[PDB]
Structures are given as C-alpha cells and as structure tokens.
Amino acid sequence: HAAMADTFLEHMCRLDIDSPPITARNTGIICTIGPASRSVETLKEMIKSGMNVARLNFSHGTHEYHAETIKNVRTATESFASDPILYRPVAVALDTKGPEIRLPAVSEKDIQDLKFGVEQDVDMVFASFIRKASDVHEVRKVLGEKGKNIKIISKIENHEGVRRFDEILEASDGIMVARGDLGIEIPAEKVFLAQKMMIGRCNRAGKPVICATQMLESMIKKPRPTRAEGSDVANAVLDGADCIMLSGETAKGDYPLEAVRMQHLIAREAEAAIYHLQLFEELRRLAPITSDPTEATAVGAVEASFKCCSGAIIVLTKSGRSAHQVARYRPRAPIIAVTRNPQTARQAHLYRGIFPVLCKDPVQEAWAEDVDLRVNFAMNVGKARGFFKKGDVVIVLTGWRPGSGFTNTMRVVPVP
Amino acid sequence: HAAMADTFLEHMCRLDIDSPPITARNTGIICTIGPASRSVETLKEMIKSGMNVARLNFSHGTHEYHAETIKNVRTATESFASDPILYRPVAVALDTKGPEIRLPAVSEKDIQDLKFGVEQDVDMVFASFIRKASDVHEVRKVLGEKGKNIKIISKIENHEGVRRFDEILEASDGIMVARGDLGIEIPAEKVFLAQKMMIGRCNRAGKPVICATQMLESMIKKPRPTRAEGSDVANAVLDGADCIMLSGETAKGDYPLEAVRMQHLIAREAEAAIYHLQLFEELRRLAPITSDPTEATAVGAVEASFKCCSGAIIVLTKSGRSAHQVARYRPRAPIIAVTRNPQTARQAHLYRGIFPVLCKDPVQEAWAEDVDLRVNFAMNVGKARGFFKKGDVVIVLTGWRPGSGFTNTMRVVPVP
Amino acid sequence: HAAMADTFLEHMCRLDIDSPPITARNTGIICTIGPASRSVETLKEMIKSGMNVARLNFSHGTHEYHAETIKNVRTATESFASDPILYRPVAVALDTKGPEIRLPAVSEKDIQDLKFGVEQDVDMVFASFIRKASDVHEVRKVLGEKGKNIKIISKIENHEGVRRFDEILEASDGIMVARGDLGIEIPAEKVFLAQKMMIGRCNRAGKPVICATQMLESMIKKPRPTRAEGSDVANAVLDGADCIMLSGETAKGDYPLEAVRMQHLIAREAEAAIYHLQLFEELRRLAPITSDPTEATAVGAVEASFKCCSGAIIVLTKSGRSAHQVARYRPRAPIIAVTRNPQTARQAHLYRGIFPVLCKDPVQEAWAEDVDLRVNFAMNVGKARGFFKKGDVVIVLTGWRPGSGFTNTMRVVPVP
Amino acid sequence: HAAMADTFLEHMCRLDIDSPPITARNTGIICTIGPASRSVETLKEMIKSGMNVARLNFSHGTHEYHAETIKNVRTATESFASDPILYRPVAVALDTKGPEIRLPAVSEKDIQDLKFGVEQDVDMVFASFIRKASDVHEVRKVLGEKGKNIKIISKIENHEGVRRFDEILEASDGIMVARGDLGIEIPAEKVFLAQKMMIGRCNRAGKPVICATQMLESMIKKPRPTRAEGSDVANAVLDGADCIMLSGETAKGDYPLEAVRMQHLIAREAEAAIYHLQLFEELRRLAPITSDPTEATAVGAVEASFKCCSGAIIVLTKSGRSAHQVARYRPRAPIIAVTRNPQTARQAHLYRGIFPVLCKDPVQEAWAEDVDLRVNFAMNVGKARGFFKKGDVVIVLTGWRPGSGFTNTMRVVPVP
Ligand SMILES: O=P(O)(O)OC[C@H]1O[C@](O)(COP(=O)(O)O)[C@@H](O)[C@@H]1O
Ligand SMILES: O=P(O)(O)OC[C@H]1O[C@](O)(COP(=O)(O)O)[C@@H](O)[C@@H]1O
Ligand SMILES: O=P(O)(O)OC[C@H]1O[C@](O)(COP(=O)(O)O)[C@@H](O)[C@@H]1O
Ligand SMILES: O=P(O)(O)OC[C@H]1O[C@](O)(COP(=O)(O)O)[C@@H](O)[C@@H]1O
Ligand SMILES: CC(=O)Nc1cc(C(F)(F)F)no1
Numbered sequence A, B, C, D: 001h002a003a004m005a006d007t008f009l010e011h012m013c014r015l016d017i018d019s020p021p022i023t024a025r026n027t028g029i030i031c032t033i034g035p036a037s038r039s040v041e042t043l044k045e046m047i048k049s050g051m052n053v054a055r056l057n058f059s060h061g062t063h064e065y066h067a068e069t070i071k072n073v074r075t076a077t078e079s080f081a082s083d084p085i086l087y088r089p090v091a092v093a094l095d096t097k098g099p100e101i102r103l104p105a106v107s108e109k110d111i112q113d114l115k116f117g118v119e120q121d122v123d124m125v126f127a128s129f130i131r132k133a134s135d136v137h138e139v140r141k142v143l144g145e146k147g148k149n150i151k152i153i154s155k156i157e158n159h160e161g162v163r164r165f166d167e168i169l170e171a172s173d174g175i176m177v178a179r180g181d182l183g184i185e186i187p188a189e190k191v192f193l194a195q196k197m198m199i200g201r202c203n204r205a206g207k208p209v210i211c212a213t214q215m216l217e218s219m220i221k222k223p224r225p226t227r228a229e230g231s232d233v234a235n236a237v238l239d240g241a242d243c244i245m246l247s248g249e250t251a252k253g254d255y256p257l258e259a260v261r262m263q264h265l266i267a268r269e270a271e272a273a274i275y276h277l278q279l280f281e282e283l284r285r286l287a288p289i290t291s292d293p294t295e296a297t298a299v300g301a302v303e304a305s306f307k308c309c310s311g312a313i314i315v316l317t318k319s320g321r322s323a324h325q326v327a328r329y330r331p332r333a334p335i336i337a338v339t340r341n342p343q344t345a346r347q348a349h350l351y352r353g354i355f356p357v358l359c360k361d362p363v364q365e366a367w368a369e370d371v372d373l374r375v376n377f378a379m380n381v382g383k384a385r386g387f388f389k390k391g392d393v394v395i396v397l398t399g400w401r402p403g404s405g406f407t408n409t410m411r412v413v414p415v416p
C-alpha cells in the first residue's frame, strides 16, 4: 500500500479508472415516495437497491392518503426482519408545505401536519423556507415534549436564509440545500457558490448537510443519465455532502429503480477519490483542545484506522452520540454502529459513513458478557456484507460502565 | 484587500454570493455551427455574446456546404474590423469524422478533409479517436509543410486512449476530453475520474485541455438550464479546463444565443472562486530550474501581479510563445497579448486567460518607438473594455531586441 | 488552551520568557565518572540532581580501579531503594579505547574490556571509531550469547564514518556524535552540518542519538557557563537529540553538581519551545502503512494525548518495545513505562521522553488484578513527582493477554 | 540542479559535508577596536579578513584617544581606494555608556558622546539600556538635524526591554540582542528564548537584528574555538541574524585576525544550509497587498532569482531603500548595490545579503548612458570577486527617471 501524493495536483494526476472501489458506500440515499413507487412490491426493490430514507411531500394529498404510504414503507421494511444479520433500518421523513403562494414560520396547515407526524412516529422533519433562528424555535415548540427526539433539518431557499445562515445552523440539527427554489430567488449562476459555502460551514461544525433537487432529472424519461448529471452527483460527494436526494426521478418518473441504482454506483466511485491526507490534517488543526474523554478517543480511533488500513470501526451506542463523533473526522473505513434503540438506528442515516445495525438479542446477566455479544454480532454483519474477511484488522470502541456518555476505550483486533 | 484563507476548508467557508466578479472572462467558448446558427445575422450576435472559436463538424455535409459556412463566419468577423479598438479575432476549427461505424488513424475521406482545411486556412484540427502517439504523427504528415502552423488537438474517446495518455500528450498540441463517446466505451460512473486525471496531467505539462459534450443539453428545448447543468460547467472551470464546448445547443437547438450567454455568466463567476494561493504555490514547487531567461521573466511577472493586485499583464508576442509561458502559472489578472500576426491572434484562444489583440498600424522607423505604440494600443483596449481605469497598475513584458525568443524585461507602470 | 501558530515564523514570534515549563524533563543526562565524582557521597548528590547514566572511560585505569567505580555507583543507587515510589534506576555504560595512537575494529585490549563488561553486568557499550557495518558485527560477536541484551551505541568520529553512515545505523542500536575527535578529522566549520544530518536520519529511523563533547566546557573552572554554551545545549535538544553528555565537567572539574543542575534547567526550558504541530505532521506522513497492531495503537495514543492535553502516557512493558514505539512520535506528555525487568528499566534512559519505573510487588493470582496493580503504582509515582494531580486525564496502554508483543488497547482515564 | 526537499525533516537528512559553499558571504561582521587592534597595520589585515564595521566602546577612554582610533580606521580604509574595483567601504559605530553602576535614558556624559559622534561623522549609534519608545525619541532629539541620517540601533538588556519590545522596534532603525547583560537580569536558561523571539519579530518587520557577546570567547587565549562556540555562531545565522559581533576576541585577546577568519568561514557554511523553499513561502504569505511599484518589483526579482539560479541581483540606489526591499525576502544570491553616496554604502552593511559598491566615475551627460556605466561597473566587481563568470545570468533592477523612489524595471541579462 503506497502513500498518498504530497500535493493536490499530484493526487489528481494519479486517479485511475482501473482500480475497483470498496464494497461499502458511505453517502446516504433519500427517495421521494409518490404514484410510481407507493406499492409494497416496488418499495421492496428500492430497499434492496440502496434506499435509506423515505421522504413524504405534504404539498399534496390528504392525511389519509399519507398514512397509507407510511404503512406500506413499514410493511416493506419488516419483510426483511426474519434474518437479523441482513436487516436494514429505513427512516421516514416528513416535508412540510411552508409559506407558499400558488408570512409566518408555521402556517395553520403546518401545525396539523407536524402534529400528525408525532402520532405516526416519524424520524425527522424537513422544515420549508427557514429565514431566521426564531423560525426553528417555533417548529421545536409545536412538536412539544412527545416529539423531542425528532430531528429538525432546515431548508435554505432564499436570500435571507443565506445571509443569516450561521444562526440558523446553531439552532438546527442539520441543513438541506434546496437548489430548485434557491435558483429562482438568487441568479442561477450563483447557486454553485451558495452550495459550497454551506457544505463547508456544516463540515466545520460537524453537522449533517443534504444536497437536493434536479440531480438526475433526465432519468424521468430515459433509462440513462446525461454526462452533466453524472458529474453533478460526484461533485456533491467530493465537496462533502452527507446525503443526496431524488425527487421527480422516484416519485413520478418511468425508471425509479434504475435511478436509485445509478446514485449507488456513482457515490461509491466518488468516495474512492477523496484526498484523505489533506482533509484529515485540516479537520484536526481546527479541532478544539477539550478535557472530554469521548472526543479524545474518537480522534485516536480515526488516526489508528489510517495507519493499519482497517476494514471498519465498530462502535456500541445508545443515543448515537459516540458514532457521530467518529463520523465528523471523515474516516475512509465504514463505521458500524451497534444499538438496541430502533429510533437511534433510523436517524444514523443522516451522517456520512455510519452503517447502523439493530441488535435484537436479550440483555445478558453479566455486563461484560453482553458487550462481547454485540461486538460479535457486528463482526458477522461485516462478514456477510463483504466489508472484510477472517484475518483482517478492525477498531472497536466501548465504554467502562453502562449508560450514555462513558465511551473511553479503543482496541485493535483481528477478525475471528 | 484581505489575504486568502490559510486552508482549503476555510476558503470554501468564506465564499460570498454578494461579491461582484471582475469584467474579464478567462475561459474560452467553442460553438458548433449548424442549421440554427449558419446565417451572417445570427453569427454577428454569437460573436457579441462571447464566442471565440467556430467548430465545423465533418461527419455530415459536402465540401461545398462547409466552404459556405467558413465564408459566413469570416464575413460576420470582418463586419467589426472598422474600429480596431473593439475588434475580436475568431478562430475556425475542423473536426474530422474518424474511424466510425454507422481500422487506421486517418481514413481516405479524412485525407480529403484535412487537405481541404489547409486550402481554406483553418487554425486548428480536432482529430477523432486517437489511440497511440503514431496516430498524431500520421495527421501531422498529411498537413505537410503548408499546414505546419495548424495546431493538432487530440480527441480521447476510448479505453486505449486513456491507458496510453502520456505518450499522446507529448505528441499533441492540446487535448479534448470527449465525454459522449468515452461514456459508452467505459462505465458511465467512471467518466468523472478520467476527466479529472486528464485535466490534472495537462495543467502539469502547461498544455491546453478542452471539456466537451452534454454540458448545457436541456437548453436545446428550454431557455434555462437545470440545476445539475449549472454545476457541471462551474466544476470544469474549477478543475482547470482552458475552454468549454457547446454542440447540439448551438447547432440544432431553439435558443443558441441564450446558451452562449449562460456559459459566459457561469464561467466568469467560477473564475472568482479559484483558490489562487495554493494553486500558484504548487505550480512553482513543480517547475524546473533552467537557465532560460523567458521562463524566469514570466514567473517574476505572475508573482508581481499577485503582490500589487494588478488589472492586467500586457505581453508583446510574434509566435505567441511568451504569452503561453505566463498563462501556465494561472494569474488572476487577464493577459493582453499584442501581435501583428493574425494567425497567432486566432490560436491564442486555446489558453486560459489570454485576451488577444491585433495591431493594424504600420511599423515605425525607430524600434523603441514601435514598441511604445503597441503598449499604448493595449492600454486603450483595456480602458474601452473596462479591465481597468486611469491610476491603476499594470505589468508590461518586452524584449531587448526585435525577433522571437528575447523577452527579458518586466515593468510596473500606472495607466496613463 | 490556544492552538499552535500556523507557520514556523509565527511560532518563533510567540515564544515567551514569562511562561513556566512543565515539571518533567524528557531528555536524558549522561555523566562521566572520574576523580572528582567517584565517592559514594558525591554520587548520591548527582543522582538527586538528575543523572540517569554513568559512563566509565576505559582509556585509563586498571580493571580493579574500574570495578570499584561500578560498586560505588550501585551502592549510591540502592541507597534510595527503601521507598519504591521515589526510586530512580541508573544505567552503567562502558566506553572502549578503540584503535588509538598516543588498524582493526576491536584491538586485543578491547576484547579484555568487553569481556570484563559482560561479567560486571553493564547495560550498554559505546564502541569507539566505527567505520563500516562489519565493525559493529565484530563487537556483537565478542559479547557472545551471555551479553546478547547489551545495547551497542556506535561512535561516529571520522570522514569514513560519515560517508558510510546509513549502513552503520542499520547495524547499531543507537549512535553517538563524537564532536571532539570529528572536529579534527573534518574542518571545524563543517561539524555542525554532520551533527544535524545525523540527528535527522536517526529521528527518521526511530533510533536513539546522543550528542557529546565540549557542551559546558567553561564550567570546569567557573561555576556559571558562557552565553554560547547555554545556546549549544538548547540547540541539540531542539534538533532532536535523545540525550546529552558531560565529560571533563563531571570527571575532572571543580563544580560537578552545578554542571549537572545547569543541564537539567536548560533542557526542561528547550522542551517547551518545540514546534509539535509541524513535527508530528511530518513523522506521520513518513510512517509506513503496516498490519502491526502495536504500531496502530501507539499512533492512536499519541494523537489522543495532543487532543485532550494529557498529563502522561502510562505503558506496561516487558522488553521495552511498546514504550519505544510511543517515543518515536515525540509526544509532549511524559511516557511512564512500568516494568518488572530491572535491565529493561536501565536501558529505557536512551529514548526521549521515557520515565522508567520498577515494580517490586509480587505477581497476583488473577491476571487482570495484576494489571490494575501496576497501573495504580504508575498513578502514585506521577502524583508524588508532580506530573499531574487528582481530576487530570491520562492515557493507559495495555495488551489482551500475558507475554511480549500483544499491546492493543488504549484507555482515557481520570486520575483517581 | 535538483529541487529542495518537501519537508523540514527531509531537508536536514540531506545536508552534505562534501559540498562546497558559494564565494559570497551574506552575514556582516562587527569588530570591537581596542589595545590589540588599534594600529594601522593590524586594521589593514582585519579589513582583508572580512571586517565590515568598527565598533568604538565609550565606556572607557577620553574623546582624544577615541578620535585617534577613528583616524587610524579611516587611514587603513583609504589605503585600498587606489583600485575602485577592489575597494570595500567600512562603517564606524559609536556604543554609548548608558545608565550604569560601577535613572534617565541619556545621561550628561552621553550628551557629550552623542554630540562628539555627529562631529566625527559616524554611521550608527548603539544606544545602551533602552526600556521604552520614549528613550529612542530622546536619542533622536540629541542628534538633532545635523545627524538625522545616523541610524539608531537599540540595545535590549533587561526584563522591561523584552516586555515592551514591540513599541521599541517601531521607534528604532534596528535592534541588538545584548546577551551578556540580559543573562544576568533574566535567568540564564531563558536567554535563548528571548533571542529567538526577537530575531523572529525583526525578520517579520523587515528590520536589521544583531547578535552580540561571548560568541567566540575561548579565542581570547587559544587559536581555535571550542565545539560549542562553532555551533553557537551557526545557529544565530540559521535563526536569521543580519550581523554577528566580536567583543573581547578583537579588543583585548591574543589572536584578533584568527577570530575574524573563523567567523567568516562558519557564516559562509551556515548560509548554504538555509531551507529557502519554506522561508520564502512564509515571508510571501505574510506580506501586505499594496499599490507600491517598488515592493512589487522586489518580490518579482527575488522570485525570478530562484527560478534561474542567478549569480547576483544588481540594484542602483541613492538612499539604499530599493536594496533594503530586496533583502527582506532573503534571496540565496548576493545583492550588489551600486551607489554614488558614500554614507549609503557604509550603512548597507546592517542588512543580510547586501554587498555595497561605491561608484567614483563622473556623471555622464545622457541619463541612459550614466545608467549603463554603473551596471557595467557592478558586472566587473562581481567578476573580480568570483561571484560569477561570463555566460552566467544576473537580475538588474532600475527606475524609469532620476531621483529616489522610482525603481520599477527588472531585466534578466547574460554576463558580458
Ligand atoms: O449513547 P452513547 O453516548 O453513544 O453511549 C455509548 C455507551 O454505550 C456503552 O458502550 C455500552 O452501554 P450499554 O450496555 O448500556 O448499552 C457505554 O459503555 C457507553 O457509555
Ligand atoms: O514570439 P515571441 O517569443 O513571443 O517573442 C516576442 C518578441 O517580441 C518582442 O518583444 C518585440 O519584437 P518585434 O518588434 O519584432 O515584434 C521581442 O523583443 C521579443 O523577443
Ligand atoms: O515487551 P512488550 O512488547 O512491550 O510487551 C508488553 C506486554 O505487557 C503486557 O501489557 C502485560 O504482560 P505481563 O503481565 O506478562 O507483564 C502484555 O499484555 C503486552 O503484550
Ligand atoms: O534611493 P532609492 O529609492 O533606492 O532610488 C533608486 C533610484 O535610482 C535610480 O535607479 C537611478 O537614479 P540616479 O540616476 O538619480 O542615481 C532611479 O531611477 C531610482 O528611482
Ligand atoms: C471540493 C473538492 O474537494 N473538489 C474536488 C476534489 C477533487 C479530487 F481531485 F479529489 F477528485 N476534484 O475536485
């Protein structure tokens, strides 16, 4: 294994089209559900193709039509639960209508929609047309105490949004760059600047950023994308997007499965071309000195994974927080997060590199025995999926006692 | 004027949508001529919109139809010759058919086409389906002695081309990345890797690279591009392409002028987001130590242009070679090259940043007097076009005696 | 705690004379024993002042005179063994005469000397006038099987030595730059170049390098050093020397204790001025990718120690090898190595940053219980010596089973 | 000619003792004159050995004894004026007594001394015990209007001096690090920190810094220096000192000429080991963007000198200011400054790299003819001294009209 080039120009000159990527795919895929992909049979196919999140668009349709979509997604998802080693969690996301002309943060219709999403147990909310930090605080208040674990992703879609960006990011759980709407309010040749500014600031803060709208638009009518569309998805992944989103392509178009399969192939290839040497150097130089044990353990773990070219980082997590701390240093290796909390496993799709697995097994009596069981479970999953094989090296992160907030141990172990 | 950020991540975070670009546009625009843009009236409009090069596609049409296209381009071009300060040179390029199925380097039909282009006085040839260095040597031999100043740009469009790339680049004058054809021969998710490898190697060699095919494809039917198409043109400019090319958009589509105007606006905006501090540092570290005076003068001139934030670099040139040496260091400022040779002025469109001007005035008796005349001419052009105004600072490059190969002097002068 | 400067020039500009150093002193001190410091009473004072190694010079004196020096050093050393928390191990080193005029690698007299040092149980040998790798192999053969754990440090002292340096370094355990002799064989204004070349190559190989001769020479006659002597010791520490050596100053001079105390104060101050940000970045970029678990754990541990500003790295070691792997990344924090092997504890003085402690306690029945005992012992030592206090953060390195070669675990723990 | 290493560690590893330095010596040599070196015969020998500046110490002696020293230095200097190509200018410097116990900035005795130095036409004043910016303003006021061109170098020698350093540097023309006195007022192990902080800040401001006291102290009694003294002079040159100073060694000692010759040899060797690639990169990143033509020309000239490995930079100067602007970028090549002003030629010894030459020839009638004469004079000097030979490449800096402040032209020319 040869070292990475010393300059950015030398790195580019060395890229190779005869060099197979690794089996894992770090970037998450979000699909809009609509007339062309509502059926249980089609949804089973989208799941096997690589869909992680199902977005429902509350611009159209009644509550009763939407509740029958949520039921089909869940049926499709549980059809795979028979074999715990190959089961994939799938999140559900609710997109609001917002202040729209066909004005206040949350309209009267949006109250009803948000309140409906707490009852149906969704994982995240995409709030349309956010202009200031007090709009996010309004949405957090309508979800109440019952929905205090639902994540809010703020949609940036006008000039005021871009100008007040830093205060919106401090209030939100994540950001969505909404290129369609944004490309009407500002001049279209400036959209690429707003996109890169916003991906840059979220990477620096360690928060999730989603790139949306018109990514594979020609695949509505034809089964292959144009040359421009292939380069637009790759460039979002190389700038640093956590997830990419399909709209029309999966909702209304003629080839929903081919579009999901195209995003899977491109993203995997772009991930092998990241210049990891310079990116990791910069995120370190920019990290605070702090007495927090969990932060010190995460940066240790990422640093060791580069030195031994490991096949994975295995993290045990209750709330997700330990896996989110490893993911902000952007390792090359996949992060396999093992959890017993089903909602923690659905939300972990928003962070780049986290591959979440749900442990079904009952708690053992001896606590050290319970810990070994979950580590062995994560080894079997990585073997079945082809992330590594017997005799390879993995990093394992754990804590010193039960409960959240005590991750402090990093081990380097051979795959049994 | 504040200094550039110390890291790449910090540079991204600081991009601003409320920051007007400079008037100059460094990247060249190549348009295909066909049924929708053959007329003298439409060509006059394309020239004012920003077209620098006219490509003729010898896949279709007779010699007699093509000769009437060359006559209309030249008429349109000379219609502006009345005012020497505002005249723009426009190059003509001949694209061969190549070994095509609807096999040797140059077919029998291609002999006739190449020989036709020497008689019509074209500036460059785009040779289709180049696989090895001995294919380029074949094309150079058919042009003969009469066409020894015609530039050969090699089209890379299959797996063999990509594998033998380094020897093709040493033989050619320039390279074209032909994404359409290349995206069938290799898997479509790998095209973006071949593109970046090839732009990287040409920047390192100081040779021109052109990015072609499907860049604004939706503008055939609609007057605005999709969000993906806007980001694909910007990313080619940020990777380091010298020129971008329109095909269907200008040949067959419904909105040829709008497509030329869209490429002009995007390219200007992307040029203001280049991270010049790191790019110039890398090209220097990679440059040979050599006893050549002209090379030492060019790097001096580029270095001074960053320190005083100059409005232009003015170069007097016979063969073009002095301007090509400044352009490989990628200055922020425009390079105004003043020449008396009309063919040197048409070919200078292939290098990023060169704005060529043709001096019409008769040679003065005293040689130092002739030199001052051409420098004053270049100052008037920059004033009329809005690159700078009275009291600004420009760099002026000249030589110590007449003839090619003696550029050795750099001055810093206020605009009179 | 503010981040380090972004450039070397900015780092220099920020040094401060009103900024107290940390209590630990990373660089080791080697003293020559002679007429002025042979007594048990004076040696007790040298030990408390900071001496780690006692060098015997076999140019003069009989075997019987030397054996009485070794007995006084050992008496002085064991006088402190009553309190296990405050005991300091002290190594003994035997310096050969070599091929000297007042010729083969090992003279007949040197056989007798080497064979005498195996019987007296020394820790290291300083072999004079090494010219080629086959000279080191000769010395290794005379020590035999009985002295296979004695370390060989090669003395570089002529032109041939410097020219064949790379092959001598691969054969040796460590290197000594012998400036006195070297400054006669090569021109004296070139000695500083040979010194920096040799410190550079040993840091790159992760091997110990010692800087010797005329460091505090004026302190033979006067109780204070000259301004030049103060800057010469600091500069050896900033280039990267593992240890510094006194000769005349402690052997023959009038102020042996003041000279030991001066070296202690200077070295401590120079260690606080190292530019750790750039040094750690370079040693990483230069490190091989390897499947060795112990290497991956060490670089993880050093990386975590910078992020949480830890007060120490605690390593359990049989052979020393785990501590030597942490030391080559040059942490800011002290490395406390806990061992049961007394010879491993004496030899660890040759590596920068290792503070060795000898565990006296009997082996516990349960192996995990034995491990906790030795970690607690190292915490008490660090508390007594003032390296940290209750509530601070330390890194602890251990293995998964008993025996050498299985270090694989890194924990971050609060001081109890 | 191979490129410099990519890292600082790699640069160190590549230093070579079998690699001859260039003939030029960039760092200036300052000698104290006293009983052992007052005679005309000995001073002629010191000049040929490499002395640039003669310091008079006004702690002892009457005005009448000092005036006879100034007369012998000037006689010795003019003895070489017969051949204009080989003449070396020599500056005279007056060191004050200061507020001393054996209190105000300038004592009553110091008024008399300063006023005496204006009458004797000295070039610089070394003001003892400067504590605040208002002390420098006091000295500037006593020199008056008559001595407004005399340079003030401030001596830093206590704790208050170091704390208020930044305001003292803005008021002064240059700084002297006075290690002898400073090493009593602060603890001696901290002197090396104060030295590096102060050299760093002066390099950043582009002002001269002198390193003084106890540099070759053992050469008072013996004809060779100790190993520590050889490394102390080299390290001041590698930190970035403009000049080094001898005191006792030339004033009172037994071997004045050998001491001057030792400083010459060491300094020449250290200059060949500077890591120019990183140093020039940092000084550029730190330089302001400004509309000043002279600054833009200087950085252009230094940048071209690295690219063509030139043998010299030739600058025509009235006040010195154009040469001082080239010197702050620390070129590898010598700067030959040609002047007609004799006081400008003596003061240019304080800046690293400037080799000043005095033109004696009468002004020509045609101004362009006068300019060519002085450039030819500088070529002959460089040939006689061995800085280059026929066919080599030099950089030549000039202005567009007569008078100070119009340098704007850089040429690359072969040596005739
Ligand atoms: O939610 P988080 O902060 O990621 O916490 C992870 C926690 O999981 C553990 O590793 C195991 O805890 P449980 O046995 O309670 O699941 C703890 O030791 C650690 O503190
Ligand atoms: O063709 P090139 O190498 O760019 O040469 C530029 C040449 O033009 C000049 O600047 C002016 O020459 P002309 O007067 O002959 O046009 C020369 O001094 C210089 O050598
Ligand atoms: O000699 P080395 O390679 O430093 O080995 C350190 C070894 O010490 C241990 O940490 C403890 O071992 P012991 O109980 O046998 O002393 C092992 O787990 C580890 O392999
Ligand atoms: O004193 P400075 O600023 O270094 O000025 C250098 C000046 O010397 C010149 O090069 C020559 O001037 P003179 O002929 O008056 O000596 C000017 O063109 C330039 O402005
Ligand atoms: C934002 C960014 O990093 N872009 C990029 C990366 C590359 C590559 F060279 F790494 F692939 N090209 O463009």
Ligand SMILES: CC(=O)Nc1cc(C(F)(F)F)no1
Pocket (backbone or CB within 6 Å): A196, B011, B012, B238, B239, B273, B274, B275
């Ligand atoms: C190849 C390359 O440099 N890509 C790139 C640059 C940027 C920007 F941040 F400079 F704009 N983003 O992607």
Ligand SMILES: CC(=O)Nc1cc(C(F)(F)F)no1
Pocket (backbone or CB within 6 Å): C011, C012, C238, C239, C273, C274, C275, D196
């Ligand atoms: C070899 C080396 O690193 N030298 C050095 C370091 C410094 C300081 F600035 F870091 F202290 N000065 O000189």
Ligand SMILES: CC(=O)Nc1cc(C(F)(F)F)no1
Pocket (backbone or CB within 6 Å): C196, D011, D012, D238, D239, D273, D274, D275
């Ligand atoms: C301050 C400084 O730069 N010190 C230094 C330089 C070198 C060398 F390696 F460049 F020589 N060693 O120590």
